Design a protein around this ligand. Structure first.
Ligand SMILES: COc1cc2c(cc1OC)[C@H](CCc1c[nH]c3cc(F)ccc13)N(C=O)CC2
Ligand SMILES: COc1cc2c(cc1OC)[C@H](CCc1c[nH]c3cc(F)ccc13)N(C=O)CC2
Ligand SMILES: [Mg+2]
Ligand SMILES: [Mg+2]
Ligand SMILES: [Zn+2]
Ligand SMILES: [Zn+2]
Lengths: 324, 320
């Protein structure tokens, strides 16, 4: 079983990694084993003097703080977003663009970006007067919480994976991680995409053919959109993966809708299992959210992401074909 | 009590004897001043607030201001409440704000510094505090003041909004959050820039503010002006506020020094210039803000601006 797991982890640089198989083969530790593999692949332990036992201890505690009883926003989703960000960071158009600290920030942000997610939306938490919404003043409620948990866990016994960074490195990393995770709030998507489109329309490329990003605002914007794309990457994956993600998000949505129905609340979009169209909802998700975003990312890194965009378009056609 | 009632008759006047009221009321200036203002504005009947619920909430809220913090305590909260109350009555703002917007501005003022520990956001961030960890370094104190102020409504017989409709509670909550978050001093320059832009594009008959974006911006700047109103008050009050903020700053500097931290501006008691700092505070923060406010409400802010300019002249004269 360990041999099979190691073989599967050889695919860590590939879009379409068998992340559900890795979750089972690793004993429900996909986030730990995928993060560890990526840190080794990128030489991050040596670069940042991260003791291996500290990394494993932190990763296992972080993974434990994802809810094993939530169908979508669990440790498998976190592992998938980590690995997807890892692939996007390796795109030819970004070669030598980001520092080791920025790479570390994007990967760490991906790992923590949904930690302790309860399986219900920000709006549900606001409308039910939850403790989380009271703590965070209705403003990026979940995303503020994910950050606070992900950072607080570094303070547990033998968990400070950043113990050997300089003070300036720790300060810079913390700010970048906050900026990245807060950009995963879906209420920020339209403004984030509008800004990415502006960057594409005005993009500068160096003599080596890579993106020129010469200020913090542009650098963090690219990292924010990269992790947002990874977060919204399910419809761009091979169909057998995509369909499993759809099954999982629908289960989580339907459970939220059942709670809304019981409380006499209006049921959130796509959350009413008695009036659902799973297939039309995927086509709409792609047409209005995922394709606009991925077509723009593909333009930023053209032509690096053409195969990913082609898969997204094929999957849209497939879901559309099930409707009639 | 008879003296206390006499002092509270000035509740509509800039320059209320708020320290006297704090003394006369047994250190309950926030409770007695809020109660008086809710009566003056008929807010208890308008929003069907039971008087015992109002008093219970106000005393609980006031208890969560720290009595051992020299500036950011219940007296400051009462002063900001009363200052906002006066600014809401500016003639140029006649007919601008609804009763719910008035309630939101007053409630926001009352809670806007609750549970303040007497140290800055930057101190909380640099000391890796629990507050900064909770709030991701962003408007750390202001998010906490809101969370405490709202959480206390859930204590026994404390829900003063129990008889507001569902939509009214939702709208009030949003407005209160928007106002208190705008009291973060790191937002001052953006707030002032937008206030200036409103002045440049202003329409009047008296101000006409059709868009909610514009109205909330005025309420944000209004409570921000009230928060930054000490140098516009009669000098005897202003000097007490200066003594208190300097004591609070110096204690933060003492903690920073004992920890071996870099001492924050104005916080080093061994290298302070209290009077030069007041003149700079007026010249760079308070006068630019209040002059822009005065333009927005031209000419209704003239007496307040006159007091600020007199006080700046006096503090400058104390510098040899
Ligand atoms: C595999 O499929 C999904 C995956 C995910 C979602 C929805 C999916 O499928 C409809 C939602 C998107 C939220 C959202 C905001 N506006 C929308 C508008 C839409 F039309 C659809 C979704 C959204 N997520 C979390 O909750 C992320 C993962
Ligand atoms: C009575 O006097 C005061 C009262 C208050 C302050 C400073 C006072 O006096 C120097 C500071 C202003 C913060 C601040 C931000 N940038 C600044 C730039 C400056 F030049 C001065 C202050 C500030 N406050 C809270 O901390 C509000 C109350
Ligand atoms: Mg999320
Ligand atoms: Mg404050
Ligand atoms: Zn996510
Ligand atoms: Zn204040």
């Amino acid at each position: 079983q360990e041999d099979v797991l190691a073989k599967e982890l050889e695919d860590v640089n590939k879009w379409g990694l068998h992340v559900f198989r890795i979750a089972e083969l690793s004993g429900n530790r996909p986030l730990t084993v995928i993060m560890h593999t990526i840190f080794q692949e990128r030489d991050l332990l040596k670069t940042f003097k991260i003791p291996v036992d500290t990394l494993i201890t932190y990763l296992m505690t972080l993974e434990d703080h994802y809810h094993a009883d939530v169908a979508y926003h669990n440790n498998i989703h976190a592992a998938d977003v980590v690995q997807s960000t890892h692939v996007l960071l390796s795109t030819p158009a970004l070669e030598a663009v980001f520092t080791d600290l920025e790479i570390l920030a994007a990967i760490f942000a991906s790992a923590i970006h949904d930690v302790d997610h309860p399986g219900v939306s920000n709006q549900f938490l606001i409308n039910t007067n939850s403790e989380l919404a009271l703590m965070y003043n209705d403003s990026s409620v979940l995303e503020n919480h994910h950050l606070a948990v992900g950072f607080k866990l570094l303070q547990e016994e033998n968990c400070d994976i950043f113990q050997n960074l300089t003070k300036k490195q720790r300060q810079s990393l913390r700010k970048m991680v906050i900026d990245i995770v807060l950009a995963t709030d879906m209420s920020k998507h339209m403004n984030l995409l509008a800004d990415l489109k502006t960057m594409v329309e005005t993009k500068k490329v160096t003599s080596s053919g890579v993106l020129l990003l010469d200020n913090y605002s542009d650098r963090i914007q690219v990292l924010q959109n990269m992790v947002h794309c990874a977060d919204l990457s399910n419809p761009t994956k091979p169909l057998q993966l995509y369909r499993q993600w759809t099954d999982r998000i629908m289960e989580e949505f339907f459970r939220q809708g059942d709670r809304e129905r019981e409380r006499g609340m209006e049921i959130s979009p796509m959350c009413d299992k008695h009036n659902a169209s799973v297939e039309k909802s995927q086509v709409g998700f792609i047409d209005y959210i995922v394709h606009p975003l991925w077509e723009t990312w593909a333009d930023l890194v053209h032509p690096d992401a053409q195969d990913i965009l082609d898969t997204l378009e094929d999957n849209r056609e497939w879901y559309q074909s099930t409707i009639p």
